[PDB]
A paper describes a structure:
In this report, we show the hypothetical protein [name], which had previously been detected in the host cell cytosol is a T3S effector and we identify a novel putative chaperone protein for this effector. Our results converge to identify [name] as a secreted protein that plays multiple and crucial roles in the initiation and support of the [name] growth cycle. In order to gain more insights into the molecular mechanism of [name] function during Chlamydia infection, we undertook a structural analysis of [name], the [name] ortholog in the strain [name] L2 434/Bu. [name] is the first chlamydial effector identified to date whose genetic disruption has such a strong impact on bacterial development in cell culture, without being fully lethal.
Indeed, LC-MS/MS analysis (data not shown) of the excised bands suggested that two unique CTL0886FL domains were present spanning residues 94–334 (CTL0886N) and residues 353–651 (CTL0886C). While equally poor diffraction was initially obtained with CTL0886C crystals, reductive methylation of surface exposed lysines enabled the growth of cubic crystals that diffracted synchrotron X-rays to 1.90 Å resolution. The structure of CTL0886C was determined using selenomethionine-labeled recombinant protein (also dimethylated) by Se-SAD and refined against the native high-resolution dataset. The final model is comprised of a single polypeptide in the asymmetric unit, 1 sulfate anion and 98 water molecules. The CTL0886C structure is comprised of 13 α-helices spanning two separate domains. Domain 1 consists of helices α1–7 arranged in a 7 helix bundle (residues 353–517). Helices α8–13 of domain 2 adopt an intertwined, globular fold with the later 3 helices (α11–13) wrapping around helices α8–10. Upon inspection of the 2Fo-Fc electron density map, four lysine residues (446, 463, 490, and 579) were modeled as dimethyl-lysine. For domain 1, each of these structures (as well as the next 10 scoring hits) are all members of the polyprenyl transferase (PTS) family. CTL0886C domain 1 is, however, lacking several α-helices typically found within the PTS family, including those involved in dimerization and extended regions typically found within the active site of PTS family enzymes (e.g., Asp-rich motifs).
Numbering used by the authors: 353 to 427, 430 to 522, 531 to 589, 598 to 650
The structure:
């Protein structure tokens, strides 16, 4: 009876290819369906057979994915819950601790829940906000994690971030429009929001810095951030024009950053959700 944290490379790649094959069975751009859930099950069984044989005992983490897919067929939360269990398993294969696999699972599951949220939902803004918190948490964890946990994160989170988006004086409103203008997917939104977040963080941490230095440092940070990079650099340059261009703009940006930064980013998220939702 096999334990996933104690697998050889051939079986690690078998498992991960099975997870990748499950992922190809759905389309995040439309509500999840019985057919997709069933197809994921068929891919899971094909990989399980390779792992332990048509009759061997399923490892705990594969058991969990099976249970999850079973429930989702009986009743969005369903596919999202199953993909969190996929990300847990993949994280365990990669040598992650229980705590790490748990964090990966909770936060990947959230990205799918955000991907499947309708823009008309009363909870859409919330879901967009929760999805950014999950994004950040995953990017933090990615950096400090073993390679296989990195693969578990990116391979399960990316499909949710691929969800398409499209649009329907105040700085937070101006930032929202700038992010949205340059974004096709949810991943585009969050990666560009993170650039703004980093711009604000750079100002706070370097209050004496002028425009050129702020941008120099931000550029370095974007180069050192976890994983298109040229596109985020180009986006940084677009933020420069809006919020760092000249002494007046910088002074405005410095007030928001020193005095309001979390509130500002959450107001930006509200305004981004408004642009996708049409609602105030």
């Amino acid at each position: 009876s096999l334990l996933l944290d104690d697998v050889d490379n051939e079986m690690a790649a078998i498992a991960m290819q099975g997870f990748r094959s499950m992922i190809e069975q759905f389309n995040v751009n439309n509500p999840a369906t019985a057919k997709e859930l069933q197809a994921m099950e068929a891919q899971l069984t094909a990989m399980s057979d390779q792992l332990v044989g048509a009759d061997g005992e399923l490892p705990a983490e594969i058991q969990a994915i099976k249970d999850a897919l079973a429930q989702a067929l009986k009743q969005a939360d369903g596919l999202a819950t199953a993909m969190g269990q996929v990300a847990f398993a993949a994280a365990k294969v990669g040598g992650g601790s229980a705590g790490t696999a748990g964090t990966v699972q909770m936060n990947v599951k959230q990205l799918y829940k955000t991907a499947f949220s309708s823009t008309s939902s009363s909870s859409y803004a919330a879901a967009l906000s929760d999805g950014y918190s999950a994004y950040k948490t995953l990017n933090s964890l990615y950096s400090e994690s073993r390679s296989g946990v990195q693969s578990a994160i990116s391979q399960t989170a990316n499909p949710a971030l691929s969800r398409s988006v499209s649009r329907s004086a105040d700085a937070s409103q101006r930032a929202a429009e700038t992010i949205v203008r340059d974004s096709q997917t949810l991943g585009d939104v969050y990666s560009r929001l993170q650039v703004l977040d980093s711009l604000m963080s750079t100002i706070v941490s370097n209050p004496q810095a002028n425009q050129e230095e702020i941008m120099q440092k931000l550029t370095a940070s974007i180069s050192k951030a976890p994983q298109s990079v040229d596109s985020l650099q180009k986006f940084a340059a677009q933020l420069e024009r809006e919020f760092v261009d000249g002494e007046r703009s910088l002074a405005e940006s410095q007030e928001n950053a020193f005095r309001k930064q979390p509130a500002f980013i959450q107001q930006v998220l509200v305004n981004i959700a408004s642009l996708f939702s049409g609602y105030l």
